[PDB]
From a paper:
Like the TET proteins, [name] is also a Fe2+ and α-KG dependent dioxygenase. Here we report the crystal structures of [name] [name] (NcT7H) in apo form, in α-KG-bound form and in complexes with α-KG and T, 5hmU or 5fU. Similar to other α-KG dependent dioxygenases, NcT7H adopts a variation of double-stranded β-helix (DSBH) fold as the core. The active site of NcT7H is located at the front end (opposite to the back end) of the DSBH core and partially covered by the α10 helix at the C-terminus.
The crystal structures of the full-length NcT7H in complex with α-KG (NcT7H-AKG), and in complexes with α-KG and T (NcT7H-T), with α-KG and 5hmU (NcT7H-5hmU), and with α-KG and 5fU (NcT7H-5fU) were solved by the MR method at 2.1 Å, 2.05 Å, 2.35 Å, and 2.15 Å resolution, respectively. In the substrate-bound NcT7H structures, T, 5hmU or 5fU binds to a pocket adjacent to the metal ion and α-KG, and has largely hydrophobic interactions and a few hydrophilic interactions with the surrounding residues. In the NcT7H-5hmU and NcT7H-5fU complexes, the uracil moiety of 5hmU or 5fU maintains almost identical interactions with the surrounding residues as that in the NcT7H-T complex. The C51 atom of 5hmU and 5fU is located about 3.7 Å and 3.9 Å away from the C1-carboxylate of α-KG, respectively. In addition, the 5-hydroxymethyl group of 5hmU or the 5-formyl group of 5fU forms a hydrogen bond with the C1-carboxylate of α-KG and a hydrogen bond with the side chain of Arg190. In the substrate-bound NcT7H structures, the side chain of Arg190 makes hydrogen-bonding interaction and/or van der Waals contacts with both the C1-carboxylate of α-KG and the C5 modification group of the substrate. In the substrate-bound NcT7H structures, the C1-carboxylate and C2-oxo groups of α-KG are located in opposite to His271 and Asp216 of the HXD/E…H motif, respectively, and Wat1 (which occupies presumably the oxygen in catalysis) is located below the plane formed by the C1-carboxylate of α-KG, Asp216 and His271 and in opposite to His214, indicating that the α-KG binding assumes the ‘off-line’ mode in NcT7H. NcT7H exhibits comparable Km and kcat values towards T and 5hmU but displays about 1.8-fold higher Km value and 2-fold higher kcat value towards 5fU, and the catalytic efficiency of NcT7H towards different substrates is in the order of 5fU ≥ T >5hmU, which are consistent with our binding affinity and activity assay results. The side chain of Tyr217 makes hydrophobic interactions with the substrates; mutation Y217F has insignificant effects on the activity towards T and 5hmU but a moderate effect on the activity towards 5fU, and mutation Y217A has moderate effects on the activity towards T and 5hmU but abolishes the activity towards 5fU. Additionally, these mutations abolish the activity for 5fU, leading to undetectable Km and kcat values.
Author numbering: -1 to 332
Write the structure that this text describes.
């Protein structure tokens, strides 16, 4: 069985490149080999690249084109569909500078004044039919005609992909192939469109510590990350260094989130990542587009150790928790 050359192999960080069609269409031997490679990637790096996924390259290109049209909207039009609450987790956001006020404590005035917010904007789309949380869609006029149908379409295709990656994890684990289905069939996921504007390289010297997206771990089961060719995504190695996650054409970068890490009793890794300047020298960095589809267990799901991830009960690291409650706590914290 032929393994691909690793997508990343640096400083102890080995991110495998895996042909997903071999899980979806292989004979039983190839299917199991591929599933095990998928799992093993999650257990070690917490990240994998997938190629030959069921989402077609020209549709993905159309989705990026559609997202680029949204972000070209005037500022007033984007704020109209602004992010509201952690409970909804839907709409437009652009991080601003914190302000010094009467309430501010003198100890951190220096820090507030010197802080540099992430140079990015985002628009988040949840599933259409979640009770009490409608998506704030922009008006379908001119270039945004077709925006909703395209993004809903993409949402459902990523939703299907999530279900399939979890099946690969289950197969790799040697548990029931369909174990995760009833934990993820609702599709309580979040489609985050990202635009990192063109920025002069010097902004990064004027604001030291300035990034495009701050270091973090994702919250959910897995995240499907579709990046353009610009570069800048970095993943933390076992040795504590950020390593470039080079774009590879027509791949999806897939990482486990904090909930899956906990769910798996820490047999699966949720790995710190960030977006910085592209590794390339240049006076101006062009606009960078990515799309992060955050996958989650159903909000109603109760999360406790998956079978086969511990031997004795004393090996269980975590109390069971409700999935929905956990996520709102992560989203509301800041
Ligand atoms: O834009 C990227 O490449 C990564 C974004 C990301 O990690 C996130 O939104 O959680
Ligand atoms: O960037 C992290 C995340 C942000 N928003 C979410 O809904 N899930 C995440 O994992
Ligand atoms: Ni992330």
């Amino acid at each position: 069985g032929s393994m691909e050359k690793a997508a990343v192999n640096e400083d102890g960080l080995v991110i495998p490149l895996i042909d997903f069609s071999k899980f979806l269409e292989g004979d039983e031997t190839l299917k199991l080999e591929t599933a095990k490679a998928i799992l093993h990637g999650f257990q070690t790096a917490g990240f994998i690249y997938l190629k030959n996924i069921p989402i077609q390259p020209d549709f993905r290109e159309h989705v990026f084109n559609t997202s680029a049209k949204f972000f070209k909207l005037p500022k007033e039009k984007k704020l109209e569909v602004g992010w509201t609450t952690p409970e909804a987790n839907r709409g437009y956001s652009a991080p601003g500078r914190e302000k010094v006020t009467q309430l501010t404590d003198p100890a951190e005035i220096e820090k507030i004044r010197s802080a540099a917010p992430d140079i990015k904007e985002s628009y988040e789309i949840g599933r259409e039919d979640e009770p009490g949380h409608p998506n704030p869609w922009p008006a379908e006029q001119d270039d945004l005609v077709g925006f909703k149908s395209t993004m809903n379409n993409f949402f459902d295709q990523c939703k299907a992909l999530h279900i399939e990656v979890m099946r690969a994890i289950a197969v790799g684990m040697g548990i029931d192939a369909n174990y995760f289905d009833s934990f993820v069939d609702v599709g309580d996921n979040i489609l985050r469109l990202l635009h990192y504007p063109a920025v002069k390289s010097e902004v990064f010297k004027i604001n030291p510590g300035q990034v495009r997206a701050g270091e973090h771990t994702d919250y959910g089961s897995i995240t499907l990350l579709f990046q353009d060719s610009r570069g800048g995504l970095q993943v933390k190695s076992p040795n504590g260094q950020f390593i470039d996650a080079t774009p590879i054409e027509n791949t999806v970068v897939v990482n486990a989130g904090d909930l899956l890490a906990r769910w798996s009793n820490d047999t699966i890794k949720s790995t710190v990542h960030r977006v910085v300047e592209p590794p390339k020298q240049e006076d101006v960095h062009p606009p960078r587009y990515s799309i992060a589809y955050f996958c989650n267990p159903n909000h109603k799901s109760y999360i406790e150790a998956i079978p086969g991830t511990y031997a004795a009960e004393s090996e269980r690291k975590y109390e069971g928790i409700n999935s929905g409650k956990y996520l709102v706590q992560r989203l509301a914290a800041t």
